[PDB]
Amino acid sequence: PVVVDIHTHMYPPSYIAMLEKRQTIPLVRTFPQADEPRLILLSSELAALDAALADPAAKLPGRPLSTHFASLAQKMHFMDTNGIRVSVISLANPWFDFLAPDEAPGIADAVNAEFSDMCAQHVGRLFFFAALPLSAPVDAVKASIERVKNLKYCRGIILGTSGLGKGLDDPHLLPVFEAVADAKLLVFLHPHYGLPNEVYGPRSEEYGHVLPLALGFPMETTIAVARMYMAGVFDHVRNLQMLLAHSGGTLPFLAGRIESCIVHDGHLVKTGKVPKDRRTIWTVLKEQIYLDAVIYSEVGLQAAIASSGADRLMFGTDHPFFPPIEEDVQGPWDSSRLNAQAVIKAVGEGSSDAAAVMGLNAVRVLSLKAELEH
Amino acid sequence: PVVVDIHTHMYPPSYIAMLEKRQTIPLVRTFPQADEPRLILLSSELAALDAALADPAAKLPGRPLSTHFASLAQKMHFMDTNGIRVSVISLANPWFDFLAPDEAPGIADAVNAEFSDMCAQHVGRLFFFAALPLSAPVDAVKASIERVKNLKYCRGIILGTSGLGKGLDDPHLLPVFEAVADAKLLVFLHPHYGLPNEVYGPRSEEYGHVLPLALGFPMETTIAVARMYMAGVFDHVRNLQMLLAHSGGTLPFLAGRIESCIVHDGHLVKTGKVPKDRRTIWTVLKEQIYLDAVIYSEVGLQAAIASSGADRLMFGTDHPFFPPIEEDVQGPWDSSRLNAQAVIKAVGEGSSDAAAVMGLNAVRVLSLK
Ligand SMILES: O=c1[nH]cc([N+](=O)[O-])c(=O)[nH]1
Ligand SMILES: O=c1[nH]cc([N+](=O)[O-])c(=O)[nH]1
Ligand SMILES: [Zn+2]
Ligand SMILES: [Zn+2]
């Protein structure tokens, strides 16, 4: 059975170029003491950057911009060294969110074209999720969607939680969901914005990136999806299919609570927002939601499997965001092996469920099969 | 076997008195169209209050202050109708967090004494978690701890996530954790502050209380516990035992991700913050954390069980915050039955795991004799 990674990232060199030229987050900066440039993507990193600029003694801000971000050759090496046959690559956060409305469509088109060309270098081993110019008017977004569906190797759209600027329950976003669903493109929902920094308290900088990455990211995903659900997006766009990063963030754990809070909400019940034929979040989890297996534990994974089914879980690695700190960065990756281990521990090595999660679900759902049998 | 509810609240009548004397949240107010007063506790309800104070046409703010909040008779009725033999009651959010430092210790002392008296009305059926005057100096907080440990029927402490005002990873809070743990009092950690309201976006009003209650609360709990763990609180206070509201919020689901982010953090590894003998979050989950079973689904519950063990899970109802909306409020509560059903579905009816979770864990852990 073929192993497929559906959660794996790149920044093309032209995108990195943009980041090096930016004055505010997201940006890339080189420091005299460091031997790699710094990638600075998050609001949480803002303080450490200010300190690093004002003081040469202070710690390096953000994270290392390793060669893995831009190197297709290293992406292929990672895949070989980690037993991965196919990658569905996506542009990383924050995609095109920071671009001015006028420039966005042109840049998105160029970058999506680059990804198609990247995939063409290793026929059958590479596919991609395209990113959209969501800062531009909805009509430009629609035209951008039509273009990417006709790009070789494109198998979906990656997007963040901000939508057009008002989140995913913004009714102006509905025709974007419709256009993507009608094009039969899987929507890969991915965090970036996290939670306002104050929630982590005055000692947050002591804990590294642990709180914003381990908590802020999955919580953002849950809030965005819950907002979509409450707004009736899944009912208004019935053919919409979504892949959720990090096994839905926390959704599989909180689904029962969300359901209880809905049926016990006085305001919602008495204004008719809780009818009897209402499609529950459980139904949506089985019908319109796919979950990645980037969850690192058989505990989380089992919850995800119970929520969506073994045929709706897809292995990912989140390469290259979590490199080994003390081992060879070109050898096997712990962050990848933990997720594979979680699969084996949860459903058994060599089982049909193991084969499904590890690649066959992605092969089926993302129509990679005709390309694999060639 | 005995059914124990460890997650169940009351406001004593005098506490309600303070609430309609308050000009800012938390507050109680009566509105023309419903003689049942409105309980307004949360930052999320602030907008709907301002709308209702200006326009007599806008929706009633907060939630109904039913008789189930202040009446001990109603508490016992709820218990009898829902098959609950024992309740470990606690003062509900926001406890004493809003009180001035000078008035706090005296008020806590009075309220904690009331709770002890209420428990005495139904011997063997009622115990309580005591609340602390955390807006007061640490010394007054320690004095309150020594007092509540000698109150009949007290079995632990309930506390929120703000601590002294800077969260639970505040070093000044370390002596409080030490005193509580040395007194062999279980700490029940409970949400209130949730998340800054902007995260719910501009349509939040349309979804009722769903986002702040279903998401904000358990996420607040997760962040607070994670901060405690990262600051080494559990290693500094090895005898500390904590009960986490709503099955740890989201902790059982994110524990794997937390571990991964720690061992892959460059700054932490390079500054010696990830030694090899390090106690993992899994270890702490098995040794110093108990989880309530207020999770509403066998899916969540199974993750909690896998995280802490079946011997560290405890049934709760969250009475009286989720009454039936169209069913008889004097009948069985769905919000309680959903959690009982989740136990049955996860471990099987009549099993020893079932009996443990439904009450025997609480009996053992909290010495309910
Ligand atoms: O900056 C980032 N941090 C973390 C992740 N990730 O874990 O999905 C990511 O994709 N991007
Ligand atoms: O105001 C509140 N809303 C909800 C809960 N609860 O469900 O834990 C609570 O304890 N207090
Ligand atoms: Zn990612
Ligand atoms: Zn509660």
Backbone angles phi, psi at A127, to 5 degrees: -130, 175
Residue A165: other Cβ atoms inside 10 A: 11
φ, ψ (nearest 5 deg) of residue A32: -50, -40
First-residue to last-residue Cα distance in chain A: 16
* H or E segment to which residue B214 belongs: none
Strand order in the sheet with B34-40: B27-31, B34-40, B63-64
Instruction: State the Cα–Cα distance between residues A141 and A133, nearest whole angstrom.
Output: 6
Which alpha helices (H) appear in chain B, and where do they start and end?
Answer: 13-19, 46-54, 72-81, 104-120, 138-148, 174-182, 210-211, 217-230, 233-236, 251-263, 266-270, 281-287, 298-308, 334-347, 352-355, 361-366
Q: In what order do the strands lie in the sheet with B289-292?
A: B4-10, B86-91, B126-131, B154-159, B186-189, B242-244, B289-292, B313-314
What are the residues whose beta carbons fall under 8 Å from the beta carbon of A90, sequence distance 6 or more? A7, A8, A9, A10, A128, A129, A131, A158, A188, A190
Distance (Å, rounded) from C-alpha B112 to C-alpha B157?
10
By the CB criterion, residues less than 5 angstroms from ion ligand 3 are A 318
Whether residue A10 contacts residue A116, with contact meaning beta carbons closer than 8 Å, is answered with no
Report the greatest alpha carbon distance in chain B: 64
**CA distances in angstroms from A351 to A1, A343, A346, A347, B303, listed in the order given:** 11, 10, 11, 7, 22
Residues 273-332 in B contacting A (C-alpha not used; CB under 8 Å) = 273, 295-300, 302-303, 306-307, 322-326
Pocket flag, ligand 1, residue A92 (CB < 6 Å): yes
**A291 beta partners:** A244, A313
Q: Report yes or no: B300 and A254 within 8 Å, Cβ to Cβ.
A: yes
Are the C-beta atoms of residues A159 and A187 closer than 8 Å to each other? Answer: yes
Q: B227: which DSSP letter?
A: H
- A150 Cα to chain B: minimum distance (Å): 34
Domains (range + CATH), chain A? 1-374 (3.20.20.140)
Q: Is A46 exposed, middle or buried (0-12, 13-18, 19+ CB in 10 A)?
A: middle
Does residue B198 belong to the interface with chain A, where contact is any CB pair within 8 Å?
Answer: yes
Residues on chain B touching A337 (C-beta within 8 angstroms) = none
Unique residue bearing structure tokens 């600029």:
A53
Neighbour count for residue A352 (Cβ, 10 Å): 13
According to DSSP, residue B167 is labeled B
Which residue, among A35, A299, A345, would best test binding to B if mutated, counting the most B CBs under 10 Å from its CB? A299
Whether B35 and B22 have beta carbons less than 8 Å apart is answered as no
DSSP string, A72-98: HHHHHHHHHHTT-SEEEEEE-TTTTTT
Backbone angles phi, psi at B329, to 5 degrees: -70, -15
What are φ and ψ of residue B312, in 5° steps?
A: -120, 15
**Contact present, B259 and A215 (Cβ < 8 Å):** no
DSSP β-ladder status, B34-40 and A289-292? unpaired
Residue A197 corresponds to which tokens in the numbers above? 């920094």
CB of A220 within 6 A of ligand 1: the answer is no
CA quadruple B19, B62, B337, B327: dihedral sign = positive
Q: How far is CA B92 from the centre of its chain?
A: 8
Buried b (16+ CB within 10 A) or exposed e, B352-368: ebbbbbbbbbbbebbeb
Q: Is A277 exposed, middle or buried (0-12, 13-18, 19+ CB in 10 A)?
A: exposed
Return d(Cα B40, Cα B55) in angstroms, integer: 17
Strand order of the β-sheet with A63-64 is A27-29, A38-40, A63-64
Core vs surface per residue B269-298: b (16+ CB within 10 A) or e = beeebbeeeeeebbebbeebbbbbbbbbbb
The minimum-distance atom of ligand 2 relative to the CA of B9 is 10
Ligand 2 centroid distance, CA of B318 (Å): 7
A137 with A101: CB under 8 angstroms? yes
Residues 133-192 of A with CB under 8 A from B: 166-167, 169-170
Residue type, A354: A
What DSSP element (H or E) covers A103?
A: none
The CA distance from B281 to A179, in Å, is: 44
DSSP state of A172: G
Q: Is the peptide bond before B332 cis (omega within 30 degrees of 0)?
A: no
Report strand pairing: A126-131 vs A154-159.
parallel
With breaks defined as C to next N over 2.5 Å, after which residues does chain B break? none
What is the DSSP pairing of strand B34-40 with strand B27-31? antiparallel
Return the SS3 of B315: coil
Contact B319, B69 (CB under 8 A): no
Q: Residue B7 annotated as binding?
A: yes
CA atoms within 13 A on the CB side of A140: 17
DSSP string computed for A303-369 = HHHHHH-GGGEE----BTSS--SSS-TTS--HHHHHHHHHHHHHH-TT-HHHHIIIIIHHHHHTT-H
Best probe of the B interface among A44, A164, A207, A273, by most B CBs < 10 A, is A207
**A318 assigned ligand-binding residue:** yes
The answer on whether A190 is annotated among ligand-binding residues is yes
Contact B52, B58 (CB under 8 A): yes
Residue A14 burial (CB count, 10 A): 12
- Percent helix, strand, coil in chain B, to 5, is 45, 15, 40
Q: Would you say how long chain A is, in residues?
A: 374
8 Å CB contact between B335 and A266: no
CB-based burial, A221-233: b 16+ in 10 Å, e otherwise: bbbbbbbbbbbeb
| Nearest in space to A104 (alpha carbons), one of A71, A154, A69, A139 | A139
Total number of residues shown for chain B: 369
Distance from CA of residue A209 to its chain's centroid?
18
Where helices occur in chain A by DSSP H, the ranges are 13-20, 46-54, 72-81, 104-119, 138-149, 174-182, 210-211, 217-230, 233-236, 251-263, 266-270, 281-287, 298-308, 334-347, 352-355, 361-365, 369-373
A192 Cα–ligand 3 center, Å: 9
CA distance A240 to A231: 14
Of B164, B209, B11, give the one whose Cα is nearest residue B92: B11
Exposed e or buried b per residue across A181-219, where buried means at least 16 C-beta atoms within 10 angstroms of its C-beta: beeebbbbbbbbbbbebebbbebbebbbbbbbbbbbbbb
* B308: CB partners within 8 A, 6+ apart: B248, B252, B285, B286, B289, B290, B291
Cα of first residue to Cα of last residue in chain B, in angstroms, is: 14
**Bridge partners of residue A29, in order along the sequence:** A38
Q: Which residues contact B363 (CB under 8 A, 6 or more apart)?
A: B2, B4, B86, B369
* CB-based contact A374:A124 (threshold 8 Å): yes
**Way the structure was solved:** X-ray
Distance from the Cα of residue B293 to its chain's centroid: 12
- DSSP-derived letter for residue A293 is -
